[PDB]
Amino acid sequence: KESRAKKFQRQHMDSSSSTYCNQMMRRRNMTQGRCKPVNTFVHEPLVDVQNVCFQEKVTCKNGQGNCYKSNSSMHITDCRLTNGSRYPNCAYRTSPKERHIIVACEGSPYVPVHFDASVE
Amino acid sequence: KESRAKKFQRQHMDSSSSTYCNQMMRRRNMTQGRCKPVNTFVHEPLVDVQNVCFQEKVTCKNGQGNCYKSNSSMHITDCRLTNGSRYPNCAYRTSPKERHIIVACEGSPYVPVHFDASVE
Ligand code: NA
Known about the structure:
Chain A is of the alpha+beta class. Chain A has helices at 4-12, 20-27, 46-50; strands at residues 38-42, 56-58, 67-69, 74-81, 92-106, 111-119. In chain A, 18% of the residues lie in helices and 36% in strands.
């Protein structure tokens, strides 16, 4: 009753991750008052990301503040607003990647406070 | 009232991926009667995976049938059962990766029917 092809779908396909940005940009309030054009989410334990503040210091994109690059590449997702989107209708392409992340850190305790960029 | 650090958490952290395999292995029935020890899920449009049947032919892992390797590397997730797990409680480590996928295809229409392996 279950075809080989359907069973391959059931066992190895999950294209639904495509829905992730639309869901999360909204849930996390980056579509209040404006559609945030780009955003990156990091899928790692908080602690691991926090530790980056004590890894390789580098120059922030704009030359301002103190930035740090992850020793390891990390799982992230880039969300990009579609060209067609107009507030209050915010749709996003979801792009999973493995990349080193660059964060800006400050304060006491010294912790991440901006996502600067990612890198191959 | 929202600290810069909390805002970074809200805008760029999502550590919840670590439970993906536990959820999906269950939802897709690979924890009925047994804990399936390993499994891979592909996060790409179905169509893009189907098109692999028309990309580079290669030898299947066990030398049997017709297998094909993706031109591009694709977003996937490997699930590995933990050594401690015992049916009916199946816990999995979730490992996102970018890899070329190798599928076996057959039939008319010619479509994927087994996940053979992945490759760097
Ligand atoms: Na699809």
